[PDB]
Amino acid sequence: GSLTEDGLSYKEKFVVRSYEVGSNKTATVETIANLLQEVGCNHAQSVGFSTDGFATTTTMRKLHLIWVTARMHIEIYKYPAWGDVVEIETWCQSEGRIGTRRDWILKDSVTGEVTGRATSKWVMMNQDTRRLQKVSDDVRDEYLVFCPQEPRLAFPEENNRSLKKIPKLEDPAQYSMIGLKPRRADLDMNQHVNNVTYIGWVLESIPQEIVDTHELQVITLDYRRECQQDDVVDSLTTTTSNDSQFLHLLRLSGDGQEINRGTTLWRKK
Amino acid sequence: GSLTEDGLSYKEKFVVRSYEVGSNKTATVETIANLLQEVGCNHAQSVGFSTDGFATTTTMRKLHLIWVTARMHIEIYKYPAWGDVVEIETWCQSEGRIGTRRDWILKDSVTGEVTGRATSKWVMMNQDTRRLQKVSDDVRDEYLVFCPQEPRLAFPEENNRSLKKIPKLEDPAQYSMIGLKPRRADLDMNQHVNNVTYIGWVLESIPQEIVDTHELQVITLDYRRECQQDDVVDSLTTTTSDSQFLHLLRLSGDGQEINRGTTLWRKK
Numbered sequence: 001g002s003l004t005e006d007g008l009s010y011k012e013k014f015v016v017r018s019y020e021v022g023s024n025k026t027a028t029v030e031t032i033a034n035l036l037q038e039v040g041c042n043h044a045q046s047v048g049f050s051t052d053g054f055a056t057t058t059t060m061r062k063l064h065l066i067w068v069t070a071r072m073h074i075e076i077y078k079y080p081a082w083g084d085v086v087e088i089e090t091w092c093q094s095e096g097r098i099g100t101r102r103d104w105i106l107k108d109s110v111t112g113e114v115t116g117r118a119t120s121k122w123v124m125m126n127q128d129t130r131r132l133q134k135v136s137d138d139v140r141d142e143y144l145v146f147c148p149q150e151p152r153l154a155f156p157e158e159n160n161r162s163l164k165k166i167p168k169l170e171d172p173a174q175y176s177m178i179g180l181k182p183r184r185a186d187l188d189m190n191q192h193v194n195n196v197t198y199i200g201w202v203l204e205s206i207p208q209e210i211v212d213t214h215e216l217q218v219i220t221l222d223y224r225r226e227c228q229q230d231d232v233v234d235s236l237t238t239t240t241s242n243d244s245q246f247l248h249l250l251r252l253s254g255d256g257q258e259i260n261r262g263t264t265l266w267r268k269k
Numbered sequence: 270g271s272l273t274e275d276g277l278s279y280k281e282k283f284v285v286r287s288y289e290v291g292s293n294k295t296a297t298v299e300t301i302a303n304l305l306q307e308v309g310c311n312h313a314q315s316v317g318f319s320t321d322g323f324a325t326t327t328t329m330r331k332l333h334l335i336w337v338t339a340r341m342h343i344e345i346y347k348y349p350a351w352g353d354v355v356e357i358e359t360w361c362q363s364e365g366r367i368g369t370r371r372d373w374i375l376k377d378s379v380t381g382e383v384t385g386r387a388t389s390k391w392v393m394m395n396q397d398t399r400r401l402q403k404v405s406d407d408v409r410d411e412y413l414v415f416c417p418q419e420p421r422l423a424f425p426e427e428n429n430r431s432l433k434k435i436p437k438l439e440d441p442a443q444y445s446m447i448g449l450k451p452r453r454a455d456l457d458m459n460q461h462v463n464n465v466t467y468i469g470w471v472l473e474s475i476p477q478e479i480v481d482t483h484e485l486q487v488i489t490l491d492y493r494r495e496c497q498q499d500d501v502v503d504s505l506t507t508t509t510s511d512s513q514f515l516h517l518l519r520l521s522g523d524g525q526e527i528n529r530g531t532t533l534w535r536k537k
């Protein structure tokens with residue numbers, strides 16, 4: 001991987017692995033999401049930022065401030081086959097005092113065609129108290145020199161899916177997967193649950209017949225609260241719809257405290 | 270990756286990924302085991318064998334025969350750091366009518382030193398019926414041309430850990446992790462639970478304090494039965510001692526054994 005010519009974006013190529021593919025012999029959405037986080041991490045490293053998945057400056061580290069994912073939106077047209085090379089280009093953009101946005105474009109290395117796209121919203125938070133705060137000007141300047149100043153949107157469209165409000169699923173859920181717990185492989189270098197695990201947990205309540213006859217086209221996931229290593233999660237899904245649409249809810253098995261909410265769109269193979 | 274000059278072994282280089290590392294910023298034993306299976310799969314592909322994790326010939330496919338892991342043994346001296354390049358060399362060897370053995374050597378691409386080694390025992394079985402068979406002679410000829418004929422052992426030593434008999438853990442277990450279930454990410458392209466998930470499940474019953482103050486040096490795992498997609502597993506560990514542990518994976522219900530193993534840990 002490497003920063004592009006203008007130094008305002010980063011590219012990397014990946015060869016799809018045998019254990020990374022599903023029943024269709026193509027990469028899973030979790031393999032895609034892992035690769036987006038890998039290229040994001042390599043972009044933060046190439047310009048001197050922290051690499052613990054929080055992209056902090058030395059100023060943020062002194063104040064115990066971290067960047068956290070508030071929302072992830074992924075759209076896949078073609079899942080890469082096992083052995084195929086996929087090229088991912090990523091860039092970051094300031095969104096004023098709200099926070100930052102990281103975008104991705106996935107391409108087939110052989111054909112050069114866009115096979116997927118992704119966007120994510122990040123907010124600034126105190127690591128310890130979990131309190132959010134708007135971006136200060138002194139912090140803003142530190143990351144602005146690594147971002148394109150004119151807008152560069154992976155999802156340009158006037159009324160696009162990446163910015164839609166997601167409602168809260170009402171009981172009773174149509175489908176559910178109960179008692180999900182993270183194991184050590186689900187944790188990162190800081191012992192926090194990897195954001196990709198929550199995508200997996202959301203998809204666990206999708207019936208196997210949907211997975212067997214459809215392909216996941218869009219996934220929009222909102223992150224409300226972090227699941228701790230010793231927490232237990234319930235995954236809930238209700239059909240909202242040729243295409244199939246679902247409404248999702250991840251909450252703690254006990255008190256029913258919401259950790260995530262999202263939507264998925266599937267297309268018949 | 271590519272077959273070596275004599276065509277009897279395969280090499281591949283891997284750059285350690287951010288999500289592949291643990292709290293020490295080095296690769297987990299599950300990341301290592303995934304890379305061993307990846308290079309094994311690429312060696313099977315380069316010589317025309319089956320794509321799935323079964324390395325079958327067209328003759329085995331007609332008789333619904335597959336190669337299955339009976340035992341996995343891994344020894345790590347240094348876990349590669351995030352961003353480091355690790356080179357893995359793998360080869361297969363016939364063991365007469367018992368089955369085959371796949372070996373691995375892990376090296377630091379910068380220093381060239383051996384940072385780890387692995388060995389695995391494979392047996393032939395019917396995929397539907399699950400019955401073992403002692404290699405049909407015609408099958409032997411098909412894979413022998415891809416194996417070194419003289420012995421090439423990753424664990425040469427005469428009384429080494431890779432061939433030790435593992436006993437069955439007796440109740441009550443000292444530690445346990447109950448209600449473990451595989452999710453879709455734990456399955457392979459054929460909807461079977463990946464062998465690396467069982468390594469993860471074994472390690473789940475190791476106390477966090479051991480993981481925090483020690484490094485895993487050796488892991489020997491025996492595979493007795495497959496855990497299905499809708500099965501629920503209990504993970505059991507007892508200290509037998511460096512720290513040594515005895516492990517048992519069994520189904521939560523009837524207590525049917527799926528795996529047994531041992532681990533050896535070194536104080537950091």
Ligand SMILES: CN(C)C(=O)Cn1cccn1
Pocket residue numbers: 043044047049055067092100101102122143146147
């Ligand atoms: C989400 N954030 C804060 C970033 O991605 C920061 N960044 C800009 C360029 C490289 N990293």
Ligand SMILES: CN(C)C(=O)Cn1cccn1
Pocket residue numbers: 312313316318323324336361369370371391412415416
């Ligand atoms: C374990 N088996 C059956 C193999 O690894 C067969 N093989 C030899 C060379 C490439 N694949």
